[PDB]
Write an enzyme that holds these catalytic residues in place. Structure first.
Site, PDB file in Angstrom:
ATOM      1  N   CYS A  81     -20.751 -31.287  64.784  1.00  0.00           N
ATOM      2  CA  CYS A  81     -19.738 -31.436  63.729  1.00  0.00           C
ATOM      3  C   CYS A  81     -18.987 -32.759  63.772  1.00  0.00           C
ATOM      4  O   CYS A  81     -18.392 -33.107  64.788  1.00  0.00           O
ATOM      5  CB  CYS A  81     -18.715 -30.311  63.827  1.00  0.00           C
ATOM      6  SG  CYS A  81     -17.254 -30.575  62.810  1.00  0.00           S
ATOM      7  N   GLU A 119     -26.285 -24.105  61.969  1.00  0.00           N
ATOM      8  CA  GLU A 119     -25.175 -23.382  62.578  1.00  0.00           C
ATOM      9  C   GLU A 119     -24.155 -24.364  63.152  1.00  0.00           C
ATOM     10  O   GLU A 119     -24.486 -25.498  63.512  1.00  0.00           O
ATOM     11  CB  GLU A 119     -25.662 -22.459  63.693  1.00  0.00           C
ATOM     12  CG  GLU A 119     -25.927 -23.136  65.046  1.00  0.00           C
ATOM     13  CD  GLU A 119     -24.711 -23.165  65.982  1.00  0.00           C
ATOM     14  OE1 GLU A 119     -24.181 -22.079  66.297  1.00  0.00           O
ATOM     15  OE2 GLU A 119     -24.302 -24.277  66.410  1.00  0.00           O
ATOM     16  N   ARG A 163     -17.307 -14.544  70.395  1.00  0.00           N
ATOM     17  CA  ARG A 163     -17.876 -15.825  69.981  1.00  0.00           C
ATOM     18  C   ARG A 163     -18.231 -15.891  68.490  1.00  0.00           C
ATOM     19  O   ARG A 163     -19.316 -15.478  68.108  1.00  0.00           O
ATOM     20  CB  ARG A 163     -19.112 -16.182  70.839  1.00  0.00           C
ATOM     21  CG  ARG A 163     -19.860 -17.438  70.342  1.00  0.00           C
ATOM     22  CD  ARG A 163     -20.943 -17.956  71.277  1.00  0.00           C
ATOM     23  NE  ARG A 163     -20.484 -19.122  72.028  1.00  0.00           N
ATOM     24  CZ  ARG A 163     -21.194 -20.237  72.174  1.00  0.00           C
ATOM     25  NH1 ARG A 163     -22.397 -20.342  71.622  1.00  0.00           N
ATOM     26  NH2 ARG A 163     -20.698 -21.255  72.851  1.00  0.00           N
ATOM     27  N   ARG A 165     -19.195 -18.061  65.134  1.00  0.00           N
ATOM     28  CA  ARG A 165     -19.820 -19.350  64.762  1.00  0.00           C
ATOM     29  C   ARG A 165     -20.193 -19.239  63.264  1.00  0.00           C
ATOM     30  O   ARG A 165     -20.105 -18.154  62.688  1.00  0.00           O
ATOM     31  CB  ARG A 165     -21.066 -19.631  65.619  1.00  0.00           C
ATOM     32  CG  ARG A 165     -20.857 -19.616  67.153  1.00  0.00           C
ATOM     33  CD  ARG A 165     -20.247 -20.917  67.739  1.00  0.00           C
ATOM     34  NE  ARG A 165     -21.181 -22.037  67.666  1.00  0.00           N
ATOM     35  CZ  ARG A 165     -20.997 -23.226  68.229  1.00  0.00           C
ATOM     36  NH1 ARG A 165     -19.904 -23.455  68.933  1.00  0.00           N
ATOM     37  NH2 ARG A 165     -21.889 -24.201  68.054  1.00  0.00           N
TER      38      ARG A 165
END
Ligand SMILES: C[S@@+](CC[C@H](N)C(=O)[O-])C[C@H]1O[C@@H](n2cnc3c(N)ncnc32)[C@H](O)[C@@H]1O
Length: 327
Positions: A81, A119, A163, A165
């Site tokens: 990112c 992802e 978690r 995502r």
């Protein structure tokens, strides 16, 4: 890693970008798809890759000409990112230059895969007050693709770990796919306590401390939440103790503290860090996967990777939509 019954993608080809450990490779290979290209520049990563898969991923991607990348049907990319320097014409293709995402796009524009699978981290949909997502969206739309994205948490798909995502799935517009959907959640039945190796093999991970404080009683029944039992030092990042009867906390690639990248757990009266194998398992990986010899690299590689299980469920649904075409 849950093993799949109906191999939906048999015959369909794919490429592995920002391969890392090769999580996407294991996921699609379990659904019958076959790999034709792999790219990853990290020396320590290409090593653990050729250890299992037999090939050394190719080097630096921004130096690879898009006309030399094999014909393929699916493009996989768990990319890093980055903020965009976009003060240009609204949003779009050109406003990508300087990013790594640009490389994905320049490869889509020339090879036209039917699906593009990506992802990223949980706070991606909100990065820069919305304009990071927007750009990836408008760039896909220009190259003629549909755009589906949703945030999923691994404790909802059989893996005991908090978690969240974001997964992004894009279909070319000419395939007319208007029925695709994300996997449905299911009750959790495996907990941290079930993934541990025998004490004998983890003695050297025990960490003793006189400033250890027990704030809570140890849990008796299993729960689908993280249970904090104590603090060490100040009680911040890397200085918290969790129960073995709850879920594991978010593995990180670059975290700090005493219980560095794994968090610390109360196991048989003493407090220790997870071992690399108990790390693979908390990420979904299978015991047949040969882990890297250096514990430091392995914690980095695992905290950066993908929860195998979740990818498998979406890969199945991809094959589904693609395979439904009535007269
Ligand atoms: C978030 S991760 C890998 C995730 C992958 N799903 C896996 O399971 O490990 C991003 C990857 O980008 C790779 N990478 C970053 N810049 C690159 C470049 N210019 N060329 C090739 N690989 C690059 C990083 O080394 C890391 O392996």
């Amino acid at each position: 890693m849950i093993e799949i019954k109906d191999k939906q993608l048999t015959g369909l080809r794919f490429i592995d970008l920002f391969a890392g450990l090769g999580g996407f490779r294991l996921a699609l290979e379990s659904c019958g798809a076959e790999c034709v290209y792999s790219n990853e520049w990290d020396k320590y990563a290409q090593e653990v890759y050729e250890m299992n898969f037999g090939e050394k991923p190719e080097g630096d991607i921004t130096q690879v000409n898009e006309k030399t990348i094999p014909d393929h049907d699916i493009l996989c990319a768990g990319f890093p990112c980055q903020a965009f320097s976009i003060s240009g014409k609204q949003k779009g293709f050109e406003d990508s230059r300087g990013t790594l995402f640009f490389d994905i796009a320049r490869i889509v524009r020339e090879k036209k895969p039917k699906v593009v699978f990506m992802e990223n981290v949980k706070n991606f949909a909100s990065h820069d007050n919305g304009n990071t997502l927007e750009v990836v969206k408008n760039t896909m739309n220009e190259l003629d693709y549909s755009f589906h994205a949703k945030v999923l948490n691994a404790l909802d798909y059989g893996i005991p770990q908090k978690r969240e995502r974001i997964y992004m799935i894009c279909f070319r517009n000419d395939l007319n796919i208007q029925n695709f959907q994300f996997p449905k959640p299911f009750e959790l039945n495996t907990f941290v306590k079930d993934l541990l190796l025998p004490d004998s093999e983890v003695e050297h991970l025990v960490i003793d401390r006189k400033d250890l404080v027990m704030t809570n009683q140890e849990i008796e029944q299993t729960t689908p939440k993280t249970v904090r039992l104590g603090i060490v030092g100040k009680g911040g990042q890397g200085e918290r103790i969790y129960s073995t009867r709850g879920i594991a906390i978010t593995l990180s690639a670059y975290g700090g503290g005493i219980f560095a990248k794994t968090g610390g757990y109360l196991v048989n009266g003493k407090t220790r860090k997870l071992h690399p194998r108990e790390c693979a398992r908390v990420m979904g990986y299978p015991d047949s996967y040969k882990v890297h010899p250096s514990t430091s690299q392995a914690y980095k590689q695992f905290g950066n990777s993908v929860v195998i299980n979740v990818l498998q469920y979406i890969a199945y649904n991809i094959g589904s939509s693609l395979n439904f075409k009535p007269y």
